[PDB]
A = this chain, B = another copy of it.
Amino acid sequence: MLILGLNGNVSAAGADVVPNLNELYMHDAAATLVRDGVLVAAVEEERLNRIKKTTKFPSNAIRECLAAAGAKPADVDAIAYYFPEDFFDDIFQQLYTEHPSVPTRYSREMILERLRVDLGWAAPPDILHYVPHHLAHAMSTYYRSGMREALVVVMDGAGERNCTTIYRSDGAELFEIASYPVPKSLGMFYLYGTRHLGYGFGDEYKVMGLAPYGDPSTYRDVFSTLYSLGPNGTYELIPRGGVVFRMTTILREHGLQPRRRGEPFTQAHMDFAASVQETTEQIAMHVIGYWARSTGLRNLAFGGGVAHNSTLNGRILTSGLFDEVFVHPASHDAGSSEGAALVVARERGERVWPLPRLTNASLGPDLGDVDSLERTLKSWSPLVDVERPDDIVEATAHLLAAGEAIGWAHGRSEFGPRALGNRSILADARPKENQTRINAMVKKRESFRPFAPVVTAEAAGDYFDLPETVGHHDFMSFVVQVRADRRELLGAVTHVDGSARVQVVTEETNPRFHRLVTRFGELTGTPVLLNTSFNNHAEPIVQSVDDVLTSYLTTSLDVLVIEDFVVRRRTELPLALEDFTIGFRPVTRLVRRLADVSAGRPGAPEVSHEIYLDHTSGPRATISAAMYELLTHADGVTPLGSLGIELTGELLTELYDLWQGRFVTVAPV
């Protein structure tokens, strides 16, 4: 049976269902394809529409999943949606009361319309089926664990009814044993803390990264008025919601004002981070500990968005409550779509359980074959030199050992937030100064951010203190201690408390990446690399050849390795664009705006030129009259060189700024 699982809102490519549709309303849109129980293809819409954690309907994800799996629309037996229909339709109705001119169409109709318009794919209404949100999460987590018995815990932001649901397995089935209502959400608590630290939706892992620098005791007393642990795994949490969240009143009362975007981080900020992280662990371990003791289960499969807290995951491993713990690479909403697919297949009669443990998150589209790639690379030759060594792994280990920081792109893209050796930025794990270098210089972000190591399965025990409890480390789900005698050596990837978010790579999972790490260690003595996501500040992980080339050229990475090829910039900045086109993204908007900005009596209006990305939280940039004129010609087909506009260094430098911001698409003819 072939099932398509979906999550996300219903918005088209170009405009949203409502103006500035809340970013909480079905974020991390994705599609999964499940064939006889096996996840055969999976990718998040963000990788394709280039909008971080997008809520847009995942049309592109569907197209690519089908092609990646060698399936056609007609092969799909059913479509599974990650939330119940009456809940989703309740949300739409709410929206419609707030926006009187938006037509009252419900989710079923709207989903099918998207399939029809974007994919030319019409189906009978009853192809669509809907599933409880927590069950979707839980089925995904449990089935992908391969475990024959497990305590299965889902902790997130919010389902239709609960923030947290506890299940025990019963062979192929799940028995729900407990839940905690939406107001007790750890996900929502962590997000509030993240917003207080001057961040937004999606930035939770940054707070988790800052927390080790802080002292949880500075604000312990204040935090103790925000929650309590009760008997038998019960807890209370300060009730979110209202004109003013009660938490806001309390913080302001104690003299804590929220950090602004781009301000430095004080010790006070780090302390607050530590308090948010500590509080989250206290409650999560209170719940998990109680239910582990009560059920006597020693296998845990943990999911929902809170399972992306790898520090918490580490605490789970060291508690000694379990013998084995599994966390899915996509424990956020994108992963629950495949859980919906599993539920729907089961309801339809399919019996696939049990399945092998998921070991490989590389389920997105690949880069095409190497022949077509070589051809594409020739089209980029005004900007880059291309070489094809006898052995790409051999060449790459040498690049790494000589001290180069590289883009590394091959095979199918990683499903879930973590790069794992298919769309990675790589460098030596040893030099401590690589933290500043990859951050401040290459990615352009905050310096405090820690980096994650990858080690081979063969060498893991030589660098890390792996706990007695067996975690599955294929997806960087867990924090572990670096061996004390290796902390100095592993300068770029050891946090201030001696910890690291570790990727333990096996040959089976990723032979090329495993061989790379193996060879690097033969050359240097140390089979460990730094592995961070391949993206600048303005984009999600790169997906296509176009994305990879753009990202390489608009950051200051030393060199790009894509499939069999080594690619290096020919100049410092990619300014020779004569034979390149400029195009708009669906969300690009270019304006000449007039406004009378004087005080007193009205006077002559002033002209501004501006480009912006018309999605929730979309960036914006002032541009010159000359840039405006140029971009009126951004048709995605005409070469820049033959627009009869003089391509000055000034104009091209301005264009480069916009390319770096991803406001436009720059590609060869």
Contact = CB atoms under 8 A, between A and B. Distances in A.
Contacts of A251: 93
A535 interface: no
Interface residues of A, number: 69
A228 interface: no
Interface in A590-607: 590-597, 599, 601-605, 607
Contact of A248 (B90, B104, B249, B590): B90
A262 B605 CA distance: 34
Contacts of A665: 602
A636 interface: yes
B634 A198 contact: no
Given A93-B248, A584-B605, A100 B20 contact: no
Given A595-B588, A635-B603, A94 B245 contact: yes
B14 A597 contact: yes
A624 to B, nearest CB: 16
A632 interface: yes
Interface stretch (A236-244, A427-435, A516-524, A652-660): A236-244
Contact of A636 (B20, B102, B195, B601): B601
Given A195-B98, A243-B91, A590 B594 contact: yes
B158 A243 contact: yes
A491 interface: no
A89 B595 contact: no
B589 A260 contact: no
A192 interface: yes
B97 A196 contact: yes
A97 B248 contact: yes
Interface string A77-108: 00000000001011101101110111110000
B635 A605 contact: yes
B242 A241 contact: yes
B595 A584 contact: yes
A184 to B, nearest CB: 14
A252 interface: yes
Interface string A367-379: 0000000000000
Give the oligomeric copy count: 2
A637 interface: yes
A244 B251 CA distance: 28
Nearest to A614: B595
Contacts of A590: 593-595, 605
A496 B594 CA distance: 49
Interface in A243-293: 243-245, 248-249, 251-252, 257-262
Interface of A: 13-14, 20, 87, 89-91, 93-94, 96-98, 100-104, 118, 158, 182, 192, 195-196, 198-200, 241-245, 248-249, 251-252, 257-262, 583-586, 588-597, 599, 601-605, 607, 631-632, 634-637, 665
17 contacts: A14-B597, A20-B20, A87-B244, A90-B244, A91-B243, A93-B257, A97-B195, A158-B243, A584-B594, A586-B596, A589-B594, A590-B593, A591-B592, A594-B632, A596-B636, A602-B635, A603-B637
